[PDB]
Design a protein around this ligand. Structure first.
Ligand code: NBS
Length: 450
């Protein structure tokens, strides 16, 4: 019945409970969602703890080299990290077959370079596990530990577990949502948006958080609080998580600190100098993927653009500032006008009829796509805002960009089809981008290579 600490965890409040990886915890009250009241067996202290920080004793989730339900694409992301010596591996669930697992390993080919081989693990009726018929085990752990000593036909011996970062605790603490202003100390100014400022800071003198400040009058607090309610329900691997908020003006928005900055910025300068088509595409698919969930959630971003796409380690992309624009009270902006409204990204029907839907966002993504293929080049190069709606209204569209493959320009076009619902879905854009270069995310090794 005991739980085991997958990671360490510092005490943030007067009411939570610190611990070390490996530390056993009695889950003495599971009657919550993201924070469990627990009691430490070693120390014996009692307090709240972040659920995604533990797993059951003897469970598979207890295993540090088990990644759960991650996509092959994602793990490959992780594994391919340069610092990872050959043989860095992980064990996740196969998506192709329900129940089966997959052992992914980094390898190096003198003639192919670094890469990751995948080996499906089949579990027999018996209950056995095995990659190859001539060697099965009773637990993934016996399998793993085995290949940890002997390669045995695998592309290489499983040297090192795949290193990952402490994950995000949903929220700063239990019930924590509308936190006192004084609990945030703004440290570093990170950017100056049109309606506010964004700072790297600390909540309760322990946590690394990102805070957004909004100039007063910007938006109705009550409305904000209401919208925040909705936002707060959107959890996605490719969406910048929301943590807590300061409702009274100057309203504050406290979320995940993304080191690598805005994808726009990053796209230009040296950061995006050795950026190749294959990497750009990936960023796009990550974005699609995020937008895909907004779509399934039946939500609307209303301000999608490179500038609202943040970067993370391993070239990870997360969508930000979703919603907020719909709360902007600035007159001109409400009328989709003025020097502060991102018109060049706005779908016509949205500029003209304020009809903001997912389909308008698909338009936006289209533009964003060109940003990707042109190192953050402001779109509609030869047009000042004022004449853009006009032009696009009449059917004008940015031609295929320099060095952008036509297929991507055609994607773009599909995103700009005058008819909102002729424009493709994110679920689609996600699939399309996810397999450009003859790689449908399939192909696992056979068995004994030797
Ligand atoms: O809308 P624009 O003007 O592009 O500018 P902002 O609304 O400030 O957002 C993007 C700019 O601010 C910085 N920035 C924004 N967010 C972050 C961030 N974490 C996400 C987050 C922060 C605050 C509240 C919830 C989530 N980590 C690091 N830098 C960030 C960027 O460098 C960019 O210049």
């Amino acid at each position: 019945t005991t739980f085991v600490a997958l990671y360490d965890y510092e005490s943030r409040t007067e009411t939570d409970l610190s611990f070390k990886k490996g530390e056993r915890l009695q889950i003495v009250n599971n009657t919550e969602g993201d924070w469990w009241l627990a009691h430490s067996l070693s120390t014996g202290q009692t307090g709240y703890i972040p659920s995604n920080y533990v797993a059951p004793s003897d469970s598979i989730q207890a295993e540090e080299w088990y990644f759960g339900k991650i996509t092959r694409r994602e793990s490959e992301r992780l594994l391919l990290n340069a610092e990872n010596p050959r043989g860095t591996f992980l064990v996740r669930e196969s998506e192709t077959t329900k129940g089966a697992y997959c052992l992914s390993v980094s390898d190096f080919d003198n003639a192919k370079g670094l890469n990751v081989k995948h080996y499906k693990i089949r579990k027999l009726d018996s209950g056995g596990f095995y990659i190859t018929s001539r060697t099965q085990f009773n637990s993934l752990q016996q399998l793993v530990a085995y290949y940890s000593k002997h390669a045995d036909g695998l592309c290489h011996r499983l040297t090192t577990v795949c290193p990952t970062s402490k994950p995000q605790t949903q929220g700063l603490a239990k019930d924590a949502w509308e936190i006192p202003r004084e609990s945030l100390r703004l440290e570093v100014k990170l950017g100056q948006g049109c309606f506010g400022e964004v700072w790297m800071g600390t909540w309760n003198g322990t946590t690394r958080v990102a805070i957004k400040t909004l100039k007063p009058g910007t938006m109705s607090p009550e409305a904000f609080l209401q919208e925040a309610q909705v936002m707060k329900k959107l959890r996605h691997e490719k969406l910048v998580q929301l943590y807590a908020v300061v409702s009274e003006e100057p309203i504050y928005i406290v979320g995940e600190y993304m080191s690598k900055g805005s994808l726009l910025d990053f796209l230009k300068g040296e950061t995006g100098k050795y950026l190749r088509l294959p990497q750009l595409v990936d960023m796009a698919a990550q974005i699609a993927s995020g937008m895909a969930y907004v779509e399934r959630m039946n939500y609307v971003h209303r301000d999608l653009r490179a500038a609202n796409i943040l970067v993370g380690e391993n070239l990870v992309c997360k969508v930000a500032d979703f919603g907020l624009a719909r709360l902007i009270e600035d007159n001109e902006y409400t009328a989709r006008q003025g020097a502060k409204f991102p018109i060049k990204w706005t779908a016509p029907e949205a500029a003209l009829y304020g009809r903001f839907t997912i389909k308008s966002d698909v338009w936006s993504f289209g533009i964003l796509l060109t940003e990707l293929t042109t190192k953050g080049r402001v779109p509609y190069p030869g047009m000042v805002n004022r004449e853009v709606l006009d032009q696009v209204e009449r059917g004008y569209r940015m031609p295929c960009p320099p060095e952008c493959p036509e297929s991507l320009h055609d994607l773009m076009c599909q995103c700009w089809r005058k008819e909102p619902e002729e424009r493709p879905t994110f679920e689609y854009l996600q699939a399309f981008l996810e397999d450009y270069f003859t790689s449908t995310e399939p192909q696992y090794q056979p068995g004994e290579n030797l």
